Design a protein around this ligand. Structure first.
Ligand SMILES: Nc1ncnc2c1ncn2[C@@H]1O[C@H](COP(=O)(O)OP(=O)(O)OP(=O)(O)O)[C@@H](O)[C@H]1O
Ligand SMILES: [Mg+2]
Lengths: 597, 400, 149, 49
RNA sequence: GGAGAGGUA
DNA sequence: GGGTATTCGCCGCGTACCTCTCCTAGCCCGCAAGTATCCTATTCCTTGCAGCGGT
DNA sequence: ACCGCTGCAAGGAATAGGATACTTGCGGGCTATATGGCGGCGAATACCC
């Protein structure tokens, strides 16, 4: 009964930023990469398979595109196990012999350390450094790899969201590769294109979100479908059975007698350790270990290596292996309760088995057929009806228009919710492009770095009802961020007062954030954060803060000032009212500039 | 373990290493074992009578399983490579035994031509006639020539006429299976019943388990397929594993000892027993490898193959590579590391060079010198010291 | 009667079931005239002692891990007032009695006004209390026919 | 609560009290309606019922 | 605005 | 095929007035599940000095 | 007379929680098929010859 529902928060608006990044991207020329016939031919010699023509079609679709000065944002989405990785490696190779810092993002650790091995096995003959960042790397390691990012000693970096901690200033990006893109929302996708607009982007998944599928069908982004499975891989015989340990036991005995390994989906981190022993008396003959995202971030290293070195048959696991881990020995999934899963998730679950000549059985343990809900049911005969090699894009198109693609200039990539026009998207984009290119004004994110951290946990922006015109909203944002006098803040104030009547609360708070930003830059204040419990201010090395009067504050109110670091001052104030918090920082910084020196 | 050995030995030799693709289906299953694998299965059984060398890995379940009675293998199979020393009239009388008709202008199934030096055939299996052109009691050409225009499309090295299944699927074999059904099992009126299904001619999933009813002859224990000088190499153990599997088979048999829909043959019919297995096991000389000390008698040799020391790395100690850095210093023989993967080599390549160790990748374990650090790329799992010749393997798993 | 009709309810897997102990009407939150003024039902909360078993899985059909019991509420039922009226929304309403077909089997005949003949056609309805009706009738050409619902 | 509240609130035989006497309410609580679910209707009733 | 019920001539 | 007979399905079924009560699912917000990141905190390896004994 | 040896202070490193995101599904809170008519007439089969 502790649900505690009905909140509200609209701390940021996204459409302005997404227009800004797209207008920046279309403005900047991309990079006509250099192609090598022969040095890359020796790299082609290295790959120990033979390409399908559809893989080759993807390859020459990528390469002849990436050697052009335009904007390359390509969907190389195919089906699972179709060798989709190697085309990405080929693009990376051709980019990196131009020394252009390919960035690869994966939605988990597991892909990063397996693809670390994959890339590192691939580039064993070339003077290129490939590195991986995660929580498995030590922080000491992280400090120096992010350093040699800036000196550009690392040429290829792969990582989790740990790369998008935004303190990673690269030397020269030319290529971005996203693997299994059907995560991240939108912000984690476009955070890297924010810092470099003209960079090239390669997008890999097996099951795209409907939003990028619609935008692929919009002509904004290129598409290469991959069919023609590369090998002797059949079709994972889907079996949707009501839960029975005997069926389970015979499946496990079938796999162990085959010698292969077992994926056991449980998707319940608390209860999976109980799930281990209750599976253990059912199959005492097996070798089973436990894997999820909540060991002590070293156990799973042993677990995955031991599993990959065949030290145990069965892995009970959560959806942390939904990302596509290959390990071609195993051929049997046991989905304990398939009911609460999307069809893309289901196609992925079928995706990790197979990957080989051997026939892979799939076991979809469900509740009783009336007991399963109709959503889970029609999902189950959806996946059961369509068991075909190369059926992924069919399933993705079925996912589309049943859930509806999200809005074209915002988050929430699935869901209809009455988006804006695609023709309107064209018109708004081109108006953004030529208005931005007009005076060549710097971007939003460029004026986030130059601007001091002035986040005060406020909903403070230009709301949609106040100005529906997102384009001139961005124009106002650029003029407001460009403002270098309080007087031009004032003419902007009377300007919007003229143009739209009364100014709402987020807009006027945005105005006074600009005001405090002005004196913060003017004195030398570098970082000023606040919250309910107080807040923390970071000065410069050359501040206009009185040191003697700073100690005087520390000894007149030790409960309200604590220097913890050289310029790192925590004030502790029960800041409950946002307006009084604004006047707190305003009047305080007024006294501080009364002590300006 | 077979799978492990299949690429363990592939690391450690050059000789042809090949398995037996057995039924991935379970004993008395209700599934198909994926026909093409069976097409790979019998191919092995084509060469098992005639190879003069070669490494074949089979596990105990395969030896437990019975096979085809081999007259079908010599009778309905025209897999044939270029090194088949065979005359002209020999294939004439063999395809006469197969029932083929002599047409010089082959158009229909079961036809062949043989004039001068040329032999042609049109099979019962496919829609393609083939020029053979036998030379001096041997075969020299495999010409995919036209059905009417007599022009070659492609010259082949080995022809593969394998029929689609273990059993003959022809109507006489259908009647034989019906006869053996009415001999052993019973007939009930049901369309879904497999007796009436093969009366309709169709092929159910677990059709392979009613195998011998298609031959009217006992199934071989496949050792009649054997060459005269094989050499059996015991791995793991037998007088536990075979009995264990026998228990599993009988457990499944009595478990599915129900359902006159698909009644099941006794396992003595479709399998060995452990008793007769060990009865046929004295027909061939054998090498038994065990990880224990045999004390003393003739035909034993205990080889000093001692375990590695405590080799482990840890970041808790100040210098993590202490065990290897001191174990190599006290080491007299060559040290082969045998990295599994190639780029993993550099995972050791930037790791031993931290302690100024640069092992060079060699190919053959016989290439080891008296004192040097070398490595393989292969599939080893645990290292050990060969104190007989002071050789050493330090695998990946010797470091974690 | 209704609770013994429905409860106990088994599960589909059959590893547990919910049974019933007793019921008890709560005290009304308001009385008749205050409900009359305010504009709300004169209602009693229903508090039922439900009881859920848990069987053991690996143990055979019929064993007990655990069983729980509590008084749990479901639904506001209006109480009839002291006279015969229900106060439902401040409007006193009366549920008038109905006079309907007693379930059973009823033989009948449309008295010769069909089939242009003057021949009578006897029919028989099996009328359940709750369920599907059943009709038998004679054809004008003496053929017995059935229809469901 | 829905299947009770609908019937006691708005049903075919849950009717408003005729309450302009003692007699009117006491002859309304004793009323025997042949209408309702499971019964006949006002415009589909013959001379005989 | 639509159903449901009751009423008058 | 054609002719008559039965059978199914739609067409209608009074006007005017007054009073009263009652007219819902869906969807999306936030919970659950998962995944990743960011902290303090407290626990835990680990080592140096302090001091205590030994010939 | 001090060397050598262990015990605890220190001090950090890690790891263990607590928050911050992102994906699916679901539930609640609002809020955006019933069985009791009948006669007439006409079109559409049923059957029979
Ligand atoms: N041209 C080819 N011919 C035969 N087999 C191939 C070929 N290309 C790739 N393969 C095999 O198919 C497998 C596909 O795995 P990989 O992860 O490389 O691509 P993918 O599975 O399509 O990508 P994802 O893991 O994102 O689904 C590879 O492990 C490789 O062994
Ligand atoms: Mg009158």
């Amino acid at each position: 009964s502790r649900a505690r529902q009905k909140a509200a928060e609209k701390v940021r608006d996204v459409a302005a930023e997404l227009l800004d990044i797209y207008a920046q991207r279309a403005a900047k020329e991309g990079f006509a990469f250099k192609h090598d016939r022969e040095q890359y031919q020796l790299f082609c010699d290295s790959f120990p398979f033979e390409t399908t023509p559809d893989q080759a079609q993807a390859i020459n679709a990528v390469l002849s595109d990436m050697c052009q000065p335009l904007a390359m944002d390509r969907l190389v989405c195919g089906d699972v196990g179709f060798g989709k990785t190697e085309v990405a490696m080929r693009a990376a190779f051709l980019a990196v012999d131009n020394h252009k810092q390919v960035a690869v993002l994966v939605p988990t650790t597991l892909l990063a350390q397996q693809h670390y091995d994959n890339f590192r096995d691939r580039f064993a003959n070339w003077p290129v450094r490939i590195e991986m960042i995660s929580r498995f790397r030590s922080a000491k390691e992280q400090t120096q790899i992010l350093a040699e990012v800036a000196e550009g000693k690392i040429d290829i970096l792969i990582g989790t969201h740990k790369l998008l901690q935004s303190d990673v200033k690269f030397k020269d990006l030319g290529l971005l590769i996203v693997d299994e893109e059907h995560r991240f929302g939108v912000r984690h996708k476009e955070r890297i294109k924010a810092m470099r607009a003209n960079v090239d982007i390669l997008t890999l998944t097996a099951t795209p979100i409907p939003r990028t599928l619609n935008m692929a069908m919009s002509g904004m982004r290129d598409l290469s479908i991959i069919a023609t499975p590369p090998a002797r891989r059949l079709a994972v015989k889907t079996f949707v059975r009501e839960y029975d340990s005997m069926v389970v036991r015979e499946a496990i005995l079938r796999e162990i007698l085959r010698g292969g390994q077992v994926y056991y989906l449980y998707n319940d981190v608390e209860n999976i350790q109980k799930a281990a022993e209750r599976l253990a008396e059912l199959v005492p003959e097996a070798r089973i270990a436990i894997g999820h995202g909540q060991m002590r971030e070293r156990e799973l290293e042993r677990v995955m290596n031991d599993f990959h070195h065949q030290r145990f048959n069965v892995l009970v696991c959560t959806t942390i292996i939904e990302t596509g881990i290959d390990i071609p020995t195993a051929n049997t999934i046991i989905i304990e309760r398939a009911d609460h899963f999307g069809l893309a998730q289901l196609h992925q679950l079928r995706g990790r088995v197979g990957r080989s000549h051997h026939q892979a059985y799939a076991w979809l343990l469900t509740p009783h057929p009336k007991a399963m809900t109709t959503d889970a049911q029609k999902r189950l005969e959806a996946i059961a009806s369509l068991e075909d090699l190369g059926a992924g894009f069919a399933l993705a198109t079925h996912d589309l228009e049943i859930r509806g693609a999200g809005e074209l200039l915002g988050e929430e990539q699935s869901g209809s919710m009455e988006t804006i026009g695609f023709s309107l998207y064209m018109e708004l984009l081109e108006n953004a492009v030529d208005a931005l290119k007009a005076g060549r004004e710097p971007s939003l994110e460029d004026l986030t770095s130059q601007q001091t951290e002035v986040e005060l946990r406020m909903p403070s922006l230009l709301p949609d009802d106040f100005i529906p015109d997102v384009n001139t909203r961005l124009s106002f944002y650029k003029r407001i961020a460009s403002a270098k006098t309080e007087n031009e803040l004032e003419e902007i104030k009377v300007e919007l007062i003229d143009r739209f009547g009364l100014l709402p609360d987020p807009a006027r708070t945005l105005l006074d954030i600009a005001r405090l930003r002005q004196q913060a830059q003017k004195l030398g204040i570098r970082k000023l954060e606040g919250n309910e419990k107080g807040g923390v201010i970071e000065f410069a090395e050359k501040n206009h803060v009185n040191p003697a009067w700073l100690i005087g504050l520390l000894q007149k109110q030790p409960q309200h000032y604590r220097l913890d670091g050289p310029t790192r001052l925590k004030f502790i104030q029960d800041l409950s009212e946002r307006k009084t918090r604004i006047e707190w920082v305003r009047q305080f910084m007024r006294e501080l500039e009364e002590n300006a020196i | 373990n077979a799978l492990r050995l299949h690429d363990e030995i592939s690391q450690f030799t050059d000789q042809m290493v090949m398995n037996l693709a057995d039924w991935e289906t379970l004993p008395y299953d209700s599934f198909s074992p994926h026909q093409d694998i069976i097409s790979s299965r019998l191919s092995t059984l084509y060469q098992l009578p005639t190879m003069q060398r070669g490494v074949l890995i089979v596990p105990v379940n395969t030896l437990m399983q019975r096979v085809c009675p081999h007259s079908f293998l010599h009778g309905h199979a025209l897999v044939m490579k270029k090194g088949q020393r065979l005359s002209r009239d020999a294939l004439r009388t063999q395809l006469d035994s197969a029932g083929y008709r002599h047409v010089d202008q082959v158009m229909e199934h079961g036809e062949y031509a043989t004039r001068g030096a040329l032999l042609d055939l049109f099979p019962m299996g496919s829609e393609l006639p083939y020029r053979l052109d036998f030379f001096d009691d041997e075969i020299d050409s495999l010409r995919v020539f036209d059905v009417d225009s007599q022009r070659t499309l492609e010259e082949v090295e080995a022809i593969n006429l394998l029929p689609a299944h273990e059993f003959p699927t022809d109507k006489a074999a259908i009647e034989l299976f019906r006869s053996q059904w009415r001999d052993t099992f019973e007939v009930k009126r049901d369309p879904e019943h497999i007796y009436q299904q093969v009366s309709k001619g169709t092929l159910p999933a677990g059709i392979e388990y009613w195998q011998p009813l298609f031959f009217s002859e006992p199934l071989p224990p496949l050792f009649s397929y054997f060459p005269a000088n094989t050499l059996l190499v015991n791995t793991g153990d037998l007088e536990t594993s075979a009995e264990r599997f026998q228990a599993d088979t009988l457990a499944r048999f009595e478990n599915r000892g129900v359902d006159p829909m698909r009644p099941l043959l006794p396992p003595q019919s479709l399998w060995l027993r452990v008793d007769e297995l060990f009865s046929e096991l004295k027909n061939w000389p054998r090498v038994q490898l065990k990880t224990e000390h045999l004390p003393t008698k003739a035909a034993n040799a205990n080889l000093g193959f001692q375990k590695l020391p405590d080799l482990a790395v840890q970041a808790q100690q100040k210098a993590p590579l202490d065990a290897l850095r001191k174990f190599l210093e006290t080491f007299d023989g060559p040290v082969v590391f045998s990295v599994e993967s190639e780029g993993r080599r550099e995972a050791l390549g930037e790791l031993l060079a931290r302690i100024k160790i640069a092992p060079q990748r060699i190919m053959r374990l016989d290439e080891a010198s008296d004192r040097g650090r070398y490595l393989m790329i292969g599939a080893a799992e645990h290292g050990f010291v060969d104190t007989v010749r002071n050789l050493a393997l330090i695998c990946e798993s010797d470091l974690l | 009667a209704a609770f013994r009709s429905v409860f106990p309810i088994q599960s589909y897997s059959g590893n547990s079931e919910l049974q019933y102990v007793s019921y008890r009407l709560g005290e009304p939150v308001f009385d008749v005239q205050e409900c009359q003024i305010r504009g709300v039902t004169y209602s009693a909360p229903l508090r039922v002692k439900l009881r859920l078993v848990i069987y053991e899985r690996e143990a055979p059909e019929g064993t007990v891990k655990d069983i729980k019991e509590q008084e749990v509420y479901m639904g506001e039922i209006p109480l009839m007032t002291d006279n015969g009226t229900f106060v439902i929304n401040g409007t006193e309403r009366v549920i008038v009695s109905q006079l309907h077909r007693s379930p059973g089997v009823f033989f009948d005949s449309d008295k010769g006004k069909t089939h242009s003949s003057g021949k009578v056609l006897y029919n028989a309805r099996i009328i359940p209390y709750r369920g599907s009706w059943l009709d038998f009738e004679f054809d004008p050409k003496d053929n017995l026919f059935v229809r469901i619902d | 609560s829905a299947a009770v509240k609908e019937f006691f609130g708005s049903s075919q035989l849950s009717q408003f009290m005729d309450q302009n006497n003692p007699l009117s309410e006491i002859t309304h609580k004793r009323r025997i309606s042949a209408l309702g679910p499971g019964g006949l209707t006002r415009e589909r009733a013959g001379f005989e019922v």
